[PDB]
Amino acid sequence: MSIITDVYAREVLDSRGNPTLEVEVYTESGAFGRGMVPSGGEHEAVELRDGDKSRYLGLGTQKAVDNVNNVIADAIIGFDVRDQQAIDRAMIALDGTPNKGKLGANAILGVSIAVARAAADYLEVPLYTYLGGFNTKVLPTPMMNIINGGSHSDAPIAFQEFMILPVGAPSFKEGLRWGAEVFHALKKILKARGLVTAVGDEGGFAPKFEGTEDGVETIIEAIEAAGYEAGENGIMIGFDCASSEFYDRKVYDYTKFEGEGAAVRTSAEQIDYLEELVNKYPIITIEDGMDENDWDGWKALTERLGKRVQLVGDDFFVTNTDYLARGIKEGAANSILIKVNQIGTLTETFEAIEMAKEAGYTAVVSHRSGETEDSTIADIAVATNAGQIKTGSLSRTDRIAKYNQLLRIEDQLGEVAVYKGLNSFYNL
Amino acid sequence: MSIITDVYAREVLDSRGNPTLEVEVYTESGAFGRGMVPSGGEHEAVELRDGDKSRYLGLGTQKAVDNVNNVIADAIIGFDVRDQQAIDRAMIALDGTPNKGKLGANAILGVSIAVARAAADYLEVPLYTYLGGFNTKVLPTPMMNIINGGSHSDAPIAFQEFMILPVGAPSFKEGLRWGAEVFHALKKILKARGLVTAVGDEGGFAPKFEGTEDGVETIIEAIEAAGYEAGENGIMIGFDCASSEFYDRKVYDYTKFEGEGAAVRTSAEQIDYLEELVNKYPIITIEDGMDENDWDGWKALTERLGKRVQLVGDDFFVTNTDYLARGIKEGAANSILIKVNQIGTLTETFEAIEMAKEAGYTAVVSHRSGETEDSTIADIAVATNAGQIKTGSLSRTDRIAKYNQLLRIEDQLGEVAVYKGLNSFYNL
Amino acid sequence: MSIITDVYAREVLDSRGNPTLEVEVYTESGAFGRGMVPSGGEHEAVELRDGDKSRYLGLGTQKAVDNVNNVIADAIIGFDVRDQQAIDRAMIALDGTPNKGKLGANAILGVSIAVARAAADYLEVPLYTYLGGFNTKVLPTPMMNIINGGSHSDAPIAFQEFMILPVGAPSFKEGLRWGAEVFHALKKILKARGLVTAVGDEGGFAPKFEGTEDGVETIIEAIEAAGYEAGENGIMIGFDCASSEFYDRKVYDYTKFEGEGAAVRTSAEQIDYLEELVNKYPIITIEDGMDENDWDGWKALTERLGKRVQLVGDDFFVTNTDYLARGIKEGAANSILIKVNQIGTLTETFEAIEMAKEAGYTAVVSHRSGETEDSTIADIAVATNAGQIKTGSLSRTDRIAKYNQLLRIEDQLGEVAVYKGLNSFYNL
Amino acid sequence: MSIITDVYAREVLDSRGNPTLEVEVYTESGAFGRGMVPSGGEHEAVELRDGDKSRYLGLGTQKAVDNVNNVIADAIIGFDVRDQQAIDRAMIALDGTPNKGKLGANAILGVSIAVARAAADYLEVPLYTYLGGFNTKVLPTPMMNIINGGSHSDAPIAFQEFMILPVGAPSFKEGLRWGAEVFHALKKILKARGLVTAVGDEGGFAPKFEGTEDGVETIIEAIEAAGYEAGENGIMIGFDCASSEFYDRKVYDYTKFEGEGAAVRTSAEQIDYLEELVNKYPIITIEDGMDENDWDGWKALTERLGKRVQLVGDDFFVTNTDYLARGIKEGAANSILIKVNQIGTLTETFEAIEMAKEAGYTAVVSHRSGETEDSTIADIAVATNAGQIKTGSLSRTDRIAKYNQLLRIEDQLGEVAVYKGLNSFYNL
């Protein structure tokens, strides 16, 4: 009865109108699990696309679906639904390639998640309880995308994302309200300036600001209009520089997004420029402040800001234990952005999280630009007491589905629920 | 064991960052059902709001939640989960008011959908099967929002919504694909013209066009760019004038949105403007072409187009069977937009669908501006073989969630699935 | 357990002493379903007879029984009992012929009904609930055969049937009493005139009246003697002209049944003659007023009486979606008599009902001259909220079995039960 | 779980359009049984009627229903469904009267049959198996009504019923076939003679014959027309004189039905008239040949025919064991007609059957004029291996329902089924 009897996949659409896949796992006892995959370098997990540029611009996932039904299914059917680690290792070996390019990183993960949710269903326990055990209590402090730049905007701004973090909320429920009220207070402000209030992929705004400072100072304005502070409760701010977007040789070219008068900074001036922003604004976290390959710049940045600011490695570590292990030894950062589909399996996802923990690094569970109605990353955030999460702005179900799921978790936990707020950053 | 042993509601957020509610129904047997609620003149069902702008600007829903947990619970617990009608009728009687303003239309619908999904879970049958019986095979022809105007835009366009319909698609699966491909093709075109590609509430665009015509032809331009004809396969176009937004006395003032040089038309001149558009562009449906109180305008409008174009009454009927019965009697329209939470219960919802069917009217299950990850309206569309559905554009998950569920329903049906396409309009 | 494990058929007798068949379906879980077939052109379903004029005058059904046990059984066993549509389509494809002449329309239906009743048994829900879902509430307004003519009588009367309809009863239970009391009041009247009170196939009388008017006016006499009215509550009257019985060329020859002085009417005079009856008597419905092939006569009849009288197509549509689809486009009638075995399956029966609905036509669930102790058509009448039913007079279990089953349904529904009475005719 | 947890009765109609009642018994285990009741001097069980001729001319049964739901229910609920005798004895004691006139014989029998069928459902065994044990194999030899006289006709015939018996049939299946074929053959003959072919309450005919003999010979004429001998296979004939209908003083006045020239016979002359018929026609059984109070006539009648012809006491015994015991002691007859509702309970029914058997009397389970779709008397006939049954003609379903059930019973038995035919009369 506990044995997996059925593994089926189908093609569906993500929050961007692009094809993805989902896997449904059945046990003979009736336990059901459905897993959906978000959208997805040379040393990271690769999703399998059809390449037929006449169907969905070549973004179809029928090849990946076939691999689940016609290959992986025959390999997984027979396993106990609860043997997660064994099932994941079975798919990794089945693929052969390091990047899961033969079967597809999306085909592999879909099954990985469905099996876990089917197991949690079989044991009649919450998903986070099954993944993390009995000691899951910490609701994550959210970094919420609010303003976009760089590739995700036409505004003269270099940084890709600007987020707000309710570090001083008594609980997650209140923190979610705080972020929401500021989102609406900002929308009101944007309308006043006659700017656009329509949202992008993550549900955040991307208005034509005068520049980076105009953008950050406008955020600070919406935070205060909502009736909050700026650093105390705070609400504090965070960056997703995505500096690799405008990195050239060995120079951080800002003219790429910010215009003709923009500055071209070296690794040393890039560190100084980040230090000026931190000193002038209530900034608590900075993601990909340095190029993915600028290791020397990452180390020098950690020495000069790592003790008082969170330095998240996204494109720098690409959810890779090899890249992270070197980050720890080199002291390149102090935080890692965990993207599930960027590694392939849930097992690999939890080994990356633990490694970051044992090193003093924080693990920030991440979403993708192309999301679904799935909210598994929320259960993962609480399952491991990550204390932090990154799952988008406050105006899209592809984002709100995760905040909703965290509300249920915080509701299920009751008095056991924990919100660390500013204390989520033990890496400081 | 089929007895409802617990009814519980909590506060959550919709796709716009505004509070809503979800209800979870439990039976002694262990069956579970969760029903979330979307956002929602004087003769309709009203949602209960807290009115405390210290929380979500007074958009809190802790009052309606309390009503479910403390009042509706004592009433529903004990009922058989399968007695849908008796349960909905009990909530209506419990409330005591026509507009469900005492307990809240949102609180009553929450329990209404939760009980249904819990009953489908208990019987181990698909929701659409439980809702409509064995004869559920028709996959709806989607009217997909793609361009917004009026109050949802800054462009000089009076019409509120513009939609594309894959009437010539062989299946829903290919229809959805066509919509997505036209949506991506249109996004490209907008960037080439230097227009905003950011999406609105429904996942559609609101570019600054030259006017109404420019918008329609840019759609046809994208339809053909995707490799589809314009009216045969089709793709066809649809309107949501929402003319009650720019109606005055007794005139349709277009200057409200289309600048100072706009044409103020009378009822007779309004019908004429619509007829010109129909003959010039491949338009197949028009929603709220006349004021919600312009019955004489609706009657004359149905006389000159009711045999060749679908006329959808949204604000004209507000999912009110008393209004619909009058529209059917006077021949005021030939289609009604069905908004679930606008009428309170599922029972009342299916009575309106049936009354419309028996009159030769089509019933178009609709979404709301504030949506959730729920996808019950997709099961409602298949359960009633309505043949049509209006659930947003091809981006946000609050819209895609419904499209994904329709794909699962079409997948489950297999050889029994049916896509009527153009034949969906039996009212023509 | 939910899988069908046994499909068995046997020969039994109908309400006329003629052979028919019944199918019993078993699931491994113990769910049981029994289906019996009523007695049964060139484009309609054909029942399979043995043709051995030495056994039951060649009306045996052993060939049909064999086809269920030795052919259909092997094809159906394995299917989930709940997959009605798939099972029906499997039998249609198995037969091959359009009219189901190879396996037999009676062999196919028997399984169709047994499977559905076995499924309703498996889910532990009422049959009408399983067939129609949760929104089944409308008890049908009955047209009750009371006086016979034409082929079913020796009296000088042309019309085949004369029925009464309790359009003004508060509920079905009262409507059934009304019809009964008038039946007994008529029996008393017939005895007074020294006429025969023995009953025919449908349990109605067929006395030697002076003619059509003497027959109708005698009915009006029994209605009033019972303490009712004639049009209000009403009780109103209906016809089953079966005009094809006395149709010749292009003339409606009344001398065929009414005698030497009878009138021979053209299509135009036939319409006028029906208009005179409607104007002089409280007539609300007329079945087969025109020949099955007289399409032109049907259209002209609908233009002149279709707005104020129900025009039922029996031999005109022969429960055929192709004939009905043309009836809608041509506007040939406004109602269809649904005979289950005349089409073959339950799926086809519900597609015919829905088509009639979406066109403004009413669907009147019909019985056959040779009935059984089965009462499935009653559950079908409520399953689809048809609002009307035709299942015989008030003095035979082959008829009373259906009225009894409707009493149970109305009793099961409770306060949810609905009786439209005169409002059953939404086609007016 | 075998405990009765609910007993519920409702009002319904019989085969004549007159009110009756049915009872539904439920157990905690989910077992269900429904027992319907047929219609029913001073020493018998009487049905309870409402006496309100504003409803069904005072034939309402809402009083007996109320007695079941409000009085009998409180008494029976809690009993084990398998304790039939204890339950029937409790209802008799509850009523307190011999004629069951307080609660109603109809109300008590309803629960009596419902409990039995519910117990057979719980044990998952055929009703006849539950009622009689393992040794139930004998399929009854049917006495089939075919021609009616006396009070049930206008023809000059004193005898109330005429019947055909397939004594020489190899099985019940072929016996039923023979009866039907003679019934259809007779219908033909009647139309050739210009006589009415409309059926009565029992599905038989009542043609205007020349007299008694003409009727018997017309039957033999049809028997031979069907290709059967007359007395060998047989077909044989039977009578139901109901001589208590035309009895006066101390004379059998035949002028009551057979015109002015009829022969008024004494008891001695009555026996003589019957003996002549027996020697002239292939008659095998005679019911109520003597007045119900003409004991001296019954004794002398059994002396001169009791060894060669079956004498059935219907009104003579009125299913009264006190009457039967006297008839057995005096040798007044050699067969008793068993009417279930005429004695109230199933327990009392089987005691009369056994008392008759042990005396060498045959027990003929009988139907009533007002029947239902129920077919319990067929299971009673097989359960007791009675070898005979009287349940109507070969048309109406109120009669055919019992024949169909006997076919199912004979089908279930297979090689164990036994048709005694002529050997059924062990009293000869």
CB A391 within 8 A of CB A403: yes
Instruction: Please classify residue D43 by burial: count the beta carbons closer than 10 Å to its beta carbon, then call 0-12 exposed, 13-18 middle and 19+ buried.
Output: exposed
CB A423 within 8 A of CB B31: no
Neighboring chain A residues of B198 at a CB cutoff of 8 Å? 196, 198-200, 206
Paired residues of D80 in beta bridges: D3
Contact C134 B135 (CB under 8 A): no
Q: Which two tokens stand for residue A326?
A: 């070197």
Contact C351 B135 (CB under 8 A): yes
| Dist. CA B407–CA A417, nearest whole Å | 37
Alpha carbons within 13 A on the beta-carbon side of C8: 10
Paired residues of A373 in beta bridges: none
Cis peptide before C234 (omega within 30 of 0): yes
Q: What is the resolution of this structure in A?
A: 2.4
**Which chain B residue has the Cα nearest residue C413?**
B86
Neighbours of A134 (CB within 10 A): 7
B162: nearest Cα among B255, B281, B30:
B281
CA separation, residue C212 to residues C142, C179, C258 (Å):
22, 21, 9
Task: Please identify which residue in the block is written with the tokens 């069907």.
Answer: D226
**Residues near B399 by beta carbon (within 8 Å), at least 6 away in sequence:** B202, B203, B367, B371, B391, B392, B393
Contact D56 C403 (CB under 8 A): no
Catalytic, C137? Answer no
Q: Shortest Cα distance from B381 to chain A (angstroms)?
A: 19
> Chain A residues contacting B, CB < 8 Å?
10-18, 22, 30, 55-57, 124, 176-177, 180-181, 183-184, 196, 198-200, 206, 371-373, 375, 394-398, 400-401, 403-404, 407-408, 411
Neighboring chain D residues of C400 at a CB cutoff of 8 Å? 13-15, 17, 372-373, 398
> Chain B residues contacting A, CB < 8 Å?
10-18, 22, 30, 55-57, 124, 176-177, 180-181, 183-184, 196, 198-200, 206, 371-373, 375, 394-398, 400-401, 403-404, 407-408, 411
Instruction: Please classify residue A215 by burial: count the beta carbons closer than 10 Å to its beta carbon, then call 0-12 exposed, 13-18 middle and 19+ buried.
Output: buried
Domain with CATH 3.20.20.120 in chain D: 125-428
Contact B358 C426 (CB under 8 A): yes
Q: Tell me the count of C-D CB pairs closer than 8 A.
A: 114
Catalytic residue among C24, C44, C202, C292: C202
Contact C10 D56 (CB under 8 A): no
Q: Shortest Cα distance from B219 to chain C (angstroms)?
A: 32
Q: Shortest Cα distance from C400 to chain D (angstroms)?
A: 6
Q: Shortest Cα distance from B360 to chain A (angstroms)?
A: 34
Neighbours of A343 (CB within 10 A): 23
C20: nearest Cα among D407, D172, D142:
D407
Chains C and A, touching by 3 or more CB pairs within 8 angstroms: no
Alpha carbons within 13 A on the beta-carbon side of C402: 33
Strands across the sheet with B4-13, in order?
B4-13, B19-27, B32-36
Neighbours of A316 (CB within 10 A): 27
Instruction: Please classify residue B280 by burial: count the beta carbons closer than 10 Å to its beta carbon, then call 0-12 exposed, 13-18 middle and 19+ buried.
Output: exposed
Q: Which two tokens stand for residue B42?
A: 């004087």
Neighboring chain C residues of B129 at a CB cutoff of 8 Å? 82
Contact A13 B394 (CB under 8 A): yes
By Cβ distance, the residue of A55, A180, A396 closest to B396 is: A396
Neighboring chain B residues of A375 at a CB cutoff of 8 Å? 373
The sign one gets for the Cα dihedral D398, D403, D406, D408 is negative
Contact C135 B85 (CB under 8 A): yes
Chains B and C, touching by 3 or more CB pairs within 8 angstroms: yes
The sign one gets for the Cα dihedral A351, A356, A357, A363 is negative
CB B290 within 8 A of CB B267: yes
Q: CATH for D3-124? A: 3.30.390.10
Catalytic residue among C339, C348, C371, C410: C339
> Chain C residues contacting D, CB < 8 Å?
10-18, 22, 30, 55-57, 124, 176-177, 180-181, 183-184, 196, 198-200, 206, 371-373, 375, 394-398, 400-401, 403-404, 407-408, 411
Q: Is C406 helix (H, G, I), strand (E, B) or coil?
A: helix
| Dist. CA C371–CA C134, nearest whole Å | 29
By Cβ distance, the residue of A11, A56, A404 closest to B12 is: A404
| Dist. CA A407–CA B372, nearest whole Å | 14
Paired residues of A138 in beta bridges: A418
| Dist. CA B267–CA B269, nearest whole Å | 5
Q: Classify strands B141-142 and B388-390 as parallel, antiparallel or unpaired.
A: parallel
Counted residue by residue, chain D has a size of 428
CB D47 within 8 A of CB D40: yes
Q: Shortest Cα distance from A79 to chain B (angstroms)?
A: 25
Return the partners of chain A (3 or more C-beta pairs < 8 Å).
Answer: B
Q: Which of B154, B404, B410 has the highest number of chain A CBs within 10 A, making it the mutation to test binding with A?
A: B404
| Dist. CA A370–CA D370, nearest whole Å | 72
**DSSP one-letter string for D363-395:** EEEE--SS--S--HHHHHHHHTT--EEE---SS
Catalytic, A47? Answer no
**Residues near C213 by beta carbon (within 8 Å), at least 6 away in sequence:** none
Contact D395 C15 (CB under 8 A): yes
Domain with CATH 3.30.390.10 in chain C: 3-124
Q: Shortest Cα distance from B347 to chain C (angstroms)?
A: 7
Contact D17 C372 (CB under 8 A): no
Neighboring chain D residues of C183 at a CB cutoff of 8 Å? 17
Task: Please identify which residue in the block is written with the tokens 């209908």.
Answer: D245
CB D26 within 8 A of CB D73: no
CB D355 within 8 A of CB D327: no
Catalytic residue among B44, B161, B202, B410: B202
Neighboring chain B residues of C359 at a CB cutoff of 8 Å? 360, 426
Q: CATH for D125-428? A: 3.20.20.120
